[PDB]
Amino acid sequence: DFSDQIINNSKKRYEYNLKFFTAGSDIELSQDSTIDQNIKGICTIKESTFATAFFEKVKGKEQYRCVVQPSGVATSSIDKVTLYVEVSNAHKTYQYDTTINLKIQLSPRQSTFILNIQSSSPIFVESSDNSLLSVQQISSSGGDDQLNNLYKYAIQPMSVSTSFQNVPLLISSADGKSKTTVTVSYS
Amino acid sequence: SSGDPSILQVDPITGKATAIAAGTTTINYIRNPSSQTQVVISIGRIKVDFSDQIINNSKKRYEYNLKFFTAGSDIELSQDSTIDQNIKGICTIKESTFATAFFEKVKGKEQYRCVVQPSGVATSSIDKVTLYVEVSNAHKTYQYDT
């Protein structure tokens, strides 16, 4: 029972209630305080390292839950946060389970530099001056580069007749929030 | 046992444990004499070691040792043989065709390295032999580079 707990913050726990039903008739088991249903279980995350999980019994009831806690902030390289849950009786005479989604310098001997930048969100890279400087994205035709989340930009003087200093290259994430500046010279 | 099975799940018998979340917890020995160890889970830095290997010969390899550290606290990871830190990585050269590089795990340790091998002799058309290194866990749930 999700309780609308969309995973958006690592400084929160995501605490998902469990309900358990009869084989062949799908009737929910009695949650009463005179009973222990003798239930054990295990919760984990599958496919992704973005969160950890565990199984918990609500102290003083036949009420049970998954507790999930993120390790970081999500990247684009995460389709899903696959929850896994096993339940068994205290002796494991059976098991049953489920899976559910949750500076630079340039010269007449080195007229090109290559700026490598790692990011899971797309990256804009700009010159403040496109009359002294040339900037171009390099197309990674090997798939090895693409798996590394590694954006690449060629950086050049716009003429080999005009030396310059400290011209700011800009760098920004495609949500506008993360920004960096790299000053460039040609000599 | 574990002090928190959601940070660090453990087998009650064979002592095998898996680092599930970033954080701090314990592993406990329940039998007399009863004992414990704390455990911490976190990569946020690379160091390369040069070992004075100046690139002067195309018939030599230049084999640069890697060290890896926590996020925020910059403590080096456990190089122990009861562990696999589950690390992958990529090494390349940038800006210059004067050399090639790759990533290597030292066979039988949690020790890792770059290996660099030149293509020729250095011409005056070369400011640098810029090394690049990426590291990630085996699933790429993160990447980090230098």
Side-chain angles (χ1 to χ4, degrees), chain A residues 88-102:
Chain A
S88 40
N89 71 310
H91 307 327
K92 287 201 157 195
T93 54
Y94 90 101
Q95 282 182 216
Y96 177 104
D97 56 342
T98 189
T99 49
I100 290 167
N101 307 288
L102 305 175

Side-chain angles (χ1 to χ4, degrees), chain A:
Chain A
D1 251 313
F2 295 90
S3 317
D4 312 348
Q5 299 182 80
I6 302 175
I7 306 181
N8 61 19
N9 179 5
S10 55
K11 303 187 181 182
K12 166 177 172 199
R13 280 183 165 195
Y14 302 80
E15 308 199 316
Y16 303 109
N17 302 292
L18 292 173
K19 291 173 156 283
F20 307 131
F21 310 76
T22 49
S25 54
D26 220 17
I27 310 174
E28 206 179 309
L29 293 179
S30 300
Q31 303 191 6
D32 180 55
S33 44
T34 67
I35 305 177
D36 191 322
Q37 296 285 353
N38 203 39
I39 298 168
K40 294 182 186 165
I42 304 180
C43 311
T44 60
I45 304 304
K46 291 183 171 170
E47 292 72 71
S48 183
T49 53
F50 171 63
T52 60
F54 63 95
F55 182 93
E56 192 173 66
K57 185 173 183 162
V58 180
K59 196 182 187 183
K61 298 189 184 187
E62 293 310 286
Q63 289 187 337
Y64 298 81
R65 65 189 198 143
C66 313
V67 175
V68 181
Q69 191 173 322
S71 61
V73 181
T75 51
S76 57
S77 69
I78 308 172
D79 322 9
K80 299 159 199 161
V81 193
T82 311
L83 179 66
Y84 179 59
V85 188
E86 182 238 295
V87 300
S88 40
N89 71 310
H91 307 327
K92 287 201 157 195
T93 54
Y94 90 101
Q95 282 182 216
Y96 177 104
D97 56 342
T98 189
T99 49
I100 290 167
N101 307 288
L102 305 175
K103 288 196 178 187
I104 295 164
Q105 254 176 269
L106 298 163
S107 68
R109 284 186 170 194
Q110 195 169 16
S111 55
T112 303
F113 182 88
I114 300 179
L115 177 62
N116 306 288
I117 320 173
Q118 195 173 44
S119 183
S120 55
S121 295
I123 326 177
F124 293 96
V125 179
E126 320 125 59
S127 186
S128 71
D129 181 347
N130 303 279
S131 74
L132 291 180
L133 242 144
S134 165
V135 183
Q136 299 183 7
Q137 191 181 350
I138 309 179
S139 40
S140 35
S141 53
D144 328 70
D145 249 357
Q146 307 178 9
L147 288 167
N148 279 274
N149 292 230
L150 194 68
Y151 290 73
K152 298 189 179 174
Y153 284 89
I155 299 174
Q156 291 177 330
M158 196 64 161
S159 181
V160 297
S161 63
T162 51
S163 307
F164 59 79
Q165 297 197 29
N166 311 290
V167 179
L169 195 88
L170 293 165
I171 304 172
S172 58
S173 56
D175 64 349
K177 305 192 203 93
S178 316
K179 301 206 174 202
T180 295
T181 315
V182 183
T183 45
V184 189
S185 305
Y186 172 53
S187 61

Side-chain angles (χ1 to χ4, degrees), chain B residues 9 19 29 40 56 64 77 90 107 112 115 129:
Chain B
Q9 188 177 27
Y29 185 73
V40 186
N56 64 7
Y64 301 110
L77 290 182
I90 304 180
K107 199 181 190 181
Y112 299 80
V115 175
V129 196

Side-chain angles (χ1 to χ4, degrees), chain B residues 122-141:
Chain B
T123 49
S124 21
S125 65
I126 306 171
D127 301 6
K128 298 184 179 193
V129 196
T130 306
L131 179 67
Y132 180 59
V133 187
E134 182 238 296
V135 301
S136 39
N137 66 6
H139 302 321
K140 291 202 156 197
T141 67

Side-chain angles (χ1 to χ4, degrees), chain B residues 66-82:
Chain B
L66 295 176
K67 288 174 153 284
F68 305 131
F69 308 76
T70 55
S73 54
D74 210 19
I75 313 174
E76 208 180 306
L77 290 182
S78 312
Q79 303 192 9
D80 186 81
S81 55
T82 67

